[PDB]
Structures are given as structure tokens and as C-alpha cells.
Design a protein around this ligand. Structure first.
Ligand SMILES: [Cl-]
Ligand SMILES: [Cl-]
Ligand SMILES: [Cl-]
Ligand SMILES: [Cl-]
Ligand SMILES: [K+]
Ligand SMILES: [Mg+2]
Ligand SMILES: [Mg+2]
Ligand SMILES: [Mg+2]
Ligand SMILES: [Mg+2]
Ligand SMILES: [Mg+2]
Ligand SMILES: [Mg+2]
Ligand SMILES: [Mg+2]
Ligand SMILES: [Mg+2]
Ligand SMILES: [Mg+2]
Ligand SMILES: [Mg+2]
Ligand SMILES: [Mg+2]
Ligand SMILES: [Mg+2]
Ligand SMILES: [Mg+2]
Ligand SMILES: [Mg+2]
Ligand SMILES: [Mg+2]
Ligand SMILES: [Mg+2]
Ligand SMILES: [Mg+2]
Ligand code: NA
Ligand code: NA
Ligand code: NA
Ligand code: NA
Ligand code: NA
Ligand code: NA
Ligand code: NA
Ligand code: NA
Ligand SMILES: [Sr+2]
Ligand SMILES: [Sr+2]
Ligand SMILES: [Sr+2]
Ligand SMILES: [Sr+2]
Ligand SMILES: [Sr+2]
Ligand SMILES: [Sr+2]
Ligand SMILES: [Sr+2]
Ligand SMILES: [Sr+2]
Ligand SMILES: [Sr+2]
Ligand SMILES: [Sr+2]
Ligand SMILES: [Sr+2]
Ligand SMILES: [Sr+2]
Ligand SMILES: [Sr+2]
Lengths: 56, 237, 194, 92
RNA sequence: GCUUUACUGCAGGCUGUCGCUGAGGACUCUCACUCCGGGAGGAGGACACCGAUAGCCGGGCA
RNA sequence: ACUCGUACGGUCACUGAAUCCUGCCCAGUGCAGGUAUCUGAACACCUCGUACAAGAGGACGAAGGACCUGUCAACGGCGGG
RNA sequence: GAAACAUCUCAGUAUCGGGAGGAACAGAAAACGCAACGUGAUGUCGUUAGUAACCGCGAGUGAACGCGAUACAGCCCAAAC
């Protein structure tokens, strides 16, 4: 079986969904954690300094 | 390189864990204050998935249903006594002090009141030899003279299910089934058949170990493979 | 004449001698079986507590904190590091055990502010420090001409910013002259070379 | 080669010719208090120490003469330029 | 990326020493501390664990 | 974690059903045991040094090594004349 | 970067953990040490200066006192009784 086109057919699982906190389609319904804002993981909002260039 | 199989083990992942949720009971001795007036009737004889030997279901005088390690010859209806002045019958639990010398014993305790540590596998037994006011010398199944406290409880008789090791597995499938019930990753790929990155014995154009197999005791995990601190190797000499 | 306080002080000069030696051997047995942060009604060292700012008033709390002994509890590098940055064993942290104690205390009490702390001994594996904490919201303090300074908005979370005496001493701020070129006004202003 | 123990030569101190005694320069023991000793203690930490991680080099097939020329009268010695000698033995 | 008796180091193991740590070159004890016991209490015991330092081994890793 | 496990166990390796068998070598390397003697760090201790300190030397000496022994179904070896 | 590279350098930089404010931090000498019959809390700016100091004494790294400015402000406990 090829890792390409024939392995794409099995992809019917729902993981990333609309988040209650930030509104982005990043709430992993199996992990109960948001990959965008960190909802489910932290009380604080997920922000990182590398999301922008060092001197910006 | 990459961490070896023995290192992946300690992480305690699903593959390396024992199917605990499928295990029946943690076979320990009953906690009596003093006296002897604790006896029970054997209701059933069950199979223990954890040790492949049989386990006896007993109901006590005070109405306690608990599984106990089954010795040889113990059946349904039989009465077993637990306590200090218990009857010296096969299947009864009483401290090593009360048990006479030259009598085969099983489920021996290390520290008095722990519930039994030694001689628990199929058909094995510990031999009680010397008596004192201080020490009770018990000869464990390995042939080692273990000096124990006389207050350590023990069940009389050999463990049931003897001679299991006598008949071969014959086929790989039978091993498969046995191993699916234990805390062991199976099958075993030889290190010599792996890549250099994966094991100290991996690599080469032909399959042979790199350095000698006898490794030092002080070797770090990742290097401690082959013959660990071997006093000698081989059959001859 | 000598104060009664001066006797508690003189006893703590040598905590391994006299009546205090027996008192510590006994008290530590109970302390080892206590928590990480334990609020206590009265300070073990009254002189030191009062000297540091403690008053037997409302909203003045004292707590004993036990922190582990030794160097850094550090993980080895999982990536490429030059010989210099390959250390694990001999690395020590830049904050002293007293400061780790003060911080653990202030977190157990999110409303209170750290006034000061002092050592109350150690065994072979842990160190004990008692921390004086103050309630900035209690009127018993908002009216105290000696402790009301701690009620100011800019004194909020003061321990975490190193504004404690143990903080300022660890930041190399003790000396006013030679040796304090890279410490004053702050470590961060001097490019972290203190 | 052979070298005389005592011989007449120039003394740069006395400003005239006198009898000199030739002695091989014995290695004077180290105090361990010089600046380089303090730098070894200071600059050595975790990992490589740079120059303090280096081990002493090899030898030349033949070493030069390391001698002391001791004056017979004033008792003050002087150093001279050495010459390559496989072995240097003294006469008397 | 990989190897090793390449160079240099880093974990880890072993070992001495100092702290915890106490009473009377071999020994006794019990009170810290450890473990077993639901508990009473039992085993062990100034050792072990832990913190520190030193010597050896140390492609397990950089 | 192994482990609701305890040597008829389970960990670490090698060989690869059955059948007939599996010789010789422990010098090197490895592992392990022993060791009169030698070598072996720091602390404490002694000498010198310094009104103190740096420092130099000595005494004792752990593991380890030297040395001896065991071991090849341990790495491996089994030739020239 | 050092024309390799280990100390060094990149750099206490990137990045990470915790936290405050409208500004933060510092701050009224157990200071300085143009050694004085002198200065007089603290930041900052200009300079002192690529000076002193560091450094496979290689590549590189790098202050301060003082001075001229800005702005100025000095106080509270613990204890004695
Ligand atoms: Cl098996
Ligand atoms: Cl605070
Ligand atoms: Cl010469
Ligand atoms: Cl001046
Ligand atoms: K580098
Ligand atoms: Mg059990
Ligand atoms: Mg088998
Ligand atoms: Mg399985
Ligand atoms: Mg296999
Ligand atoms: Mg392959
Ligand atoms: Mg490897
Ligand atoms: Mg093969
Ligand atoms: Mg092979
Ligand atoms: Mg590099
Ligand atoms: Mg600033
Ligand atoms: Mg326990
Ligand atoms: Mg490598
Ligand atoms: Mg095959
Ligand atoms: Mg380069
Ligand atoms: Mg160069
Ligand atoms: Mg720099
Ligand atoms: Mg200055
Ligand atoms: Na707080
Ligand atoms: Na510094
Ligand atoms: Na230095
Ligand atoms: Na590659
Ligand atoms: Na051999
Ligand atoms: Na270059
Ligand atoms: Na290169
Ligand atoms: Na350098
Ligand atoms: Sr699927
Ligand atoms: Sr979470
Ligand atoms: Sr963030
Ligand atoms: Sr139990
Ligand atoms: Sr048990
Ligand atoms: Sr190989
Ligand atoms: Sr043989
Ligand atoms: Sr706050
Ligand atoms: Sr240094
Ligand atoms: Sr070093
Ligand atoms: Sr040469
Ligand atoms: Sr050998
Ligand atoms: Sr002023």
C-alpha cells in the first residue's frame, strides 16, 4: 500500500474543531487542548516570541 | 546512537507493561492479631493468569472471600487453618518457628507480616533446616541458605502446578499466547542482527559481536549487554 | 540591661551547642513530617523576626518552608553542546535556597506579600526558613506607620522581582562601591553580567 | 664529549681572567605560587580548559649544554650559549 | 550518520572522605535516619539513603 | 516499569526443529576472584615554611592497577620450519 | 568568529519560566581613595577610554573613580529606657 493517495482514504477522524475560547479550528477533540490558544492546557493564552522576528 | 531495547523497557509503556487489569489477586497472607481461631473451607480452584499455577478460593469463619496460593493436593471442601497453633497439615499457614525441621514449605516471608515473597512459582519449595531462638535457616529453591526470622509466616507443602517446565512449547504460537499474559515484549531479535545505531553488537558484514560479550558491572545502561559481570562462561573447564 | 530577645539571639549564634542542640534534634523530627509550607502561629526566632519587621498584629503571617539541599537538579543536554556547556553535576543555581523558600511561601499565600525571611536550620538533606508575610488589604496594616509601605501597588509580587532583602543581597547589591559595577541598578540593565 | 671541570677563562663580573668550575644546571623546584599557577586554578572549569588541557611535548634527538660557570675567586656564576652534545662527561 | 585502545569532555557505576551523626583498629548500644507491621510492635542502625568532594572505570552520550 | 511477579521466576546475551556431535588454546583482549609485596586521590594527622595563608615534604592508604588464579556455547586463534 | 578547533567568541544574545508599573529597577555609605586641610544617596547623558583589566597573552573582550551635565530629598525600624 502506498503512503500517498491510497492512505488518504482512511482519513475520516475528527480531531481539530472550533474552539470555545478563541474561535479557531484548533481544538483537538481527543486531547481536549487547543493548538492555537492553549485552551485546555493553560489559563494563560498561548503566545510565543518566535511567532515574530526577533527584533519585532 | 539510539536507546537500546532495555532502555525503552524502563519507561513503562503499554508494550512493556503487564496486563494488570486482567489479573485476579495479589496473593498475600491473612492478617491475624494472635491466637489461632481462623479457619476456612476451599470453595473453588481457579487459574491465575499471572503465574500459570493454580489458585485456591477460600471462605473464612468471619465471612472473608479471598484467593490464596494453592499447594499440592488441596481440593474443594478441604479445611485450612491460619494462625500460630495451626495444624501441621499441607496447605496451612503458620510461622517458621512452629513448623518442624525437614518439612517442604512455600510462600515464605522476608520480613514478618509482608504476605510471602519466596517460593511462589509452579512446583517449587523452600526447605526448613535449622532452628534457634534468633534464626530459622531456610533453603530456597535456588539452593541458597537464607537465614530468616522465626516469626516469618509460610504455607506448608510444595506449590501446585509442578512439572510445567518439563513439556516443550513446540510452536511459536504457544509462546505468543503465554507472553501476551505476562509483562514481556516478545519476540526477541538478537543484537547481533541489528544495526550499529541500535545495539552495541549491531553492524558488520557478518553477524558477530563487536567486542567481547562479558561486560563490567560498572557499565552504563546502554552498554550493559551480553554477559553481565560473568564469573565465567562456557560449559567446559 | 540585656533584653530577653538578646538571649534567643545569642542561642542561635551556635545552633549546635547547648539547649538549642537538643531542641533542634527534637523539633526537626516533627518538621520532617510536616509539609513544604507550614503556617505557624509564633516565630521560632522572635528577636530575628522583630528585627526583620515582624509585629504581633493582625495580618502578619509567618510560615516555615523546607527546600532541598545542594546544587541544581538539572537535566543533561539532549542536543549538541560544546564541552563547556556539557555540565550536569557541578552546576549550581543563581538563586540561593532562602529565595526559593520565600517564593514557595508567597505562592501558597497569593494575597500576602513577603516582608522577610530567616534560617531556622538544616539536616543532611533539606534546609528550613521561616518567612514573614504581610496582608496589604487588612486595615490593621493599612494604618500601621511602620508596615503600610507594603500596601502600594508597586509592591505587588515583590519577591518574584527580587525586591526582598534576600533578593537584593543575592543580586549583588550589598556594596555601594567597588565590585558593584554590573549589579546596580539592576542585573538586566547591565546585560546580565552580575 | 669530554669537558674539563676547572679551567681558566673570562669572568664578566670580575672583569679579568680567573679559574672557573663547570657544573650542570640542576632544576630548581617550583613554588606553585607564580601567576601561571593561579591562572590554571582560575581558568579551569567544566569541559576543556584550553591551554591547560594540553600535555607536554616531545624531545629533540640531542639537547644543548645547560651549564653554569662558577668563578674561583668571587664565587659568582655566569651563563653561556650551549652547544649540541649527546653526552657531556667531566674531567676530574 | 556510524566506529574505535583518535583528541577532549559529559552522564553513569565502583571507592575514600565531610555533613546528616548519637551513647558506651577492633567492638558494644540506641535516640536520629531506613524498612516491615493495621496496630502493638518488629528488623536495621549511626551504617544505609540524601547533600558535597576525591580517585578509578566510563563511545552509554557530546 | 518489571510487579496482582519471586529462581518451574525474569532480566541480559548467543545459537537456531529433530538426529549424530560439538576437539585443542587462558599468551593478548574481556569479565570475574584473590593479593605478602609494589603502586594508588582528597579529608584529617605529623615536618618545614608564613606572627596567619599560599607552598614544599612525610606518614596512612580505598577502589583500581601491578602480580596470581578461574573462564572460550567470551572476543577470538588452531601456522612457519 | 578564531580563516581547522577544544578555552575564548557569537552571548548572558535567541528562546523559555515567573512578575510589576505607567514607567520599572536603584537609593541616603561597614561609599570613594584625582591619599586629601578632599568628595558626599540613586539613576541617566557627555567624557574619562578602547584607558586599566582579561585572553590558545591568539582572535578578541573591556570597566571604574573623577569630571561636565540632568534632576535633586531625605527618612522609618529593631534594641536600650
Ligand atoms: Cl517463558
Ligand atoms: Cl511577595
Ligand atoms: Cl649539560
Ligand atoms: Cl573626589
Ligand atoms: K562553539
Ligand atoms: Mg501477591
Ligand atoms: Mg526456555
Ligand atoms: Mg503483550
Ligand atoms: Mg531471535
Ligand atoms: Mg541489517
Ligand atoms: Mg555505539
Ligand atoms: Mg551466523
Ligand atoms: Mg555468529
Ligand atoms: Mg562548533
Ligand atoms: Mg534602568
Ligand atoms: Mg514504605
Ligand atoms: Mg562521536
Ligand atoms: Mg538464520
Ligand atoms: Mg570557523
Ligand atoms: Mg590561531
Ligand atoms: Mg564579554
Ligand atoms: Mg572606583
Ligand atoms: Na503573593
Ligand atoms: Na560576575
Ligand atoms: Na576568574
Ligand atoms: Na549521513
Ligand atoms: Na587467553
Ligand atoms: Na574559518
Ligand atoms: Na569542520
Ligand atoms: Na581565552
Ligand atoms: Sr482508520
Ligand atoms: Sr493539561
Ligand atoms: Sr508567552
Ligand atoms: Sr502490603
Ligand atoms: Sr507480597
Ligand atoms: Sr557487530
Ligand atoms: Sr570444552
Ligand atoms: Sr498580583
Ligand atoms: Sr573561574
Ligand atoms: Sr576541566
Ligand atoms: Sr623526536
Ligand atoms: Sr585471560
Ligand atoms: Sr544631593
Amino acid at each position: 500500500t502506498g503512503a500517498g493517495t491510497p492512505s488518504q482514504g482512511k482519513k475520516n477522524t475528527t480531531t481539530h474543531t472550533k474552539c470555545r475560547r478563541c474561535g479557531e479550528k484548533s481544538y483537538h477533540t481527543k486531547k481536549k487542548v487547543c493548538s492555537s490558544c492553549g485552551f485546555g492546557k493553560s489559563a494563560k493564552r498561548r503566545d510565543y516570541e518566535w511567532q515574530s522576528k526577533a527584533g519585532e | 546512537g539510539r536507546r537500546i531495547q532495555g532502555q525503552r523497557r524502563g519507561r513503562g509503556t503499554s508494550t512493556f507493561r503487564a496486563p494488570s487489569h486482567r489479573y485476579k489477586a495479589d496473593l498475600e497472607h491473612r492478617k491475624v492479631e494472635d491466637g489461632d481461631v481462623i479457619a476456612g473451607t476451599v470453595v473453588d480452584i481457579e487459574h491465575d493468569p499471572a503465574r500459570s499455577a493454580p489458585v485456591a478460593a477460600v471462605e473464612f469463619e468471619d465471612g472473608d472471600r479471598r484467593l490464596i496460593l494453592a499447594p499440592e493436593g488441596v481440593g474443594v471442601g478441604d479445611e485450612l487453618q491460619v494462625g500460630v497453633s495451626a495444624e501441621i497439615a499441607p496447605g496451612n499457614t503458620l510461622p517458621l518457628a512452629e513448623i518442624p525441621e525437614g518439612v517442604p514449605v512455600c510462600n515464605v516471608e522476608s520480613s514478618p507480616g509482608d504476605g510471602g515473597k519466596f517460593a511462589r512459582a509452579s512446583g517449587v519449595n523452600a526447605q526448613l533446616l535449622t532452628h534457634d531462638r534468633n534464626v530459622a535457616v531456610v533453603k530456597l529453591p535456588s539452593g541458597e541458605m537464607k537465614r530468616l526470622d522465626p516469626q516469618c509466616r509460610a504455607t506448608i507443602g510444595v506449590v501446585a502446578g509442578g512439572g510445567r517446565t518439563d513439556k516443550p512449547f513446540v510452536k511459536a504460537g504457544n509462546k505468543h499466547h503465554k507472553m501476551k499474559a505476562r509483562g514481556t515484549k516478545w519476540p526477541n531479535v538478537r543484537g547481533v542482527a541489528m544495526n550499529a545505531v541500535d545495539h552495541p553488537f549491531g553492524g558488520g558484514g557478518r553477524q558477530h559481536p563487536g567486542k567481547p560479550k562479558s561486560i563490567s558491572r560498572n557499565a552504563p545502561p546502554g552498554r550493559k549487554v551480553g554477559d553481565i559481570a560473568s564469573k565465567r562462561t562456557g560449559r567446559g573447564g | 540591661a540585656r533584653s530577653a530577645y538578646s538571649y534567643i539571639r545569642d542561642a542561635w549564634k551556635n545552633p549546635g551547642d547547648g539547649q538549642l542542640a537538643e531542641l533542634q534534634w527534637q523539633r526537626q523530627q516533627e518538621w520532617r513530617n510536616e509539609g513544604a509550607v507550614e503556617r505557624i502561629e509564633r516565630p521560632t526566632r522572635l528577636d530575628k523576626a522583630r528585627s526583620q519587621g515582624y509585629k504581633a498584629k493582625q495580618g502578619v503571617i509567618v510560615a516555615r518552608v523546607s527546600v532541598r539541599k545542594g546544587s541544581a537538579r538539572k537535566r543533561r543536554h539532549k542536543a549538541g553542546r560544546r564541552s563547556k556547556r556539557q555540565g550536569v553535576t557541578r552546576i549550581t543555581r543563581r538563586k540561593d535556597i532562602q529565595r526559593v523558600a520565600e517564593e514557595r511561601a508567597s505562592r501558597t499565600f497569593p494575597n500576602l506579600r513577603v516582608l522577610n525571611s530567616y534560617s531556622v536550620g538544616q539536616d543532611g538533606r533539606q534546609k528550613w526558613h521561616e518567612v514573614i508575610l504581610i496582608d496589604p488589604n487588612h486595615p490593621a496594616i493599612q494604618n500601621d506607620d511602620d508596615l503600610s509601605w507594603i500596601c502600594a501597588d508597586d509592591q505587588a509580587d515583590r519577591v518574584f522581582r527580587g525586591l526582598t532583602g534576600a533578593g537584593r543581597r543575592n543580586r549583588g547589591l550589598s556594596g555601594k562601591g567597588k565590585g558593584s559595577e554590573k549589579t546596580r541598578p539592576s542585573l538586566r540593565s547591565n546585560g546580565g553580567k552580575g | 664529549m669530554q669537558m674539563p671541570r676547572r679551567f681558566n677563562t673570562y669572568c664578566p663580573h670580575c672583569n679579568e681572567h680567573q679559574e672557573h668550575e663547570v657544573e650542570k644546571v640542576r632544576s630548581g623546584r617550583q613554588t606553585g605560587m607564580k601567576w601561571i599557577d593561579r591562572q590554571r586554578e582560575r581558568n579551569s572549569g567544566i569541559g576543556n580548559d584550553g591551554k591547560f588541557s594540553k600535555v607536554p611535548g616531545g624531545d629533540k634527538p640531542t639537547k644543548k649544554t645547560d651549564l653554569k660557570y662558577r668563578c674561583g675567586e668571587c664565587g659568582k656564576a655566569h651563563l653561556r650559549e650551549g652547544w649540541r652534545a649527546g653526552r657531556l662527561e667531566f674531567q676530574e
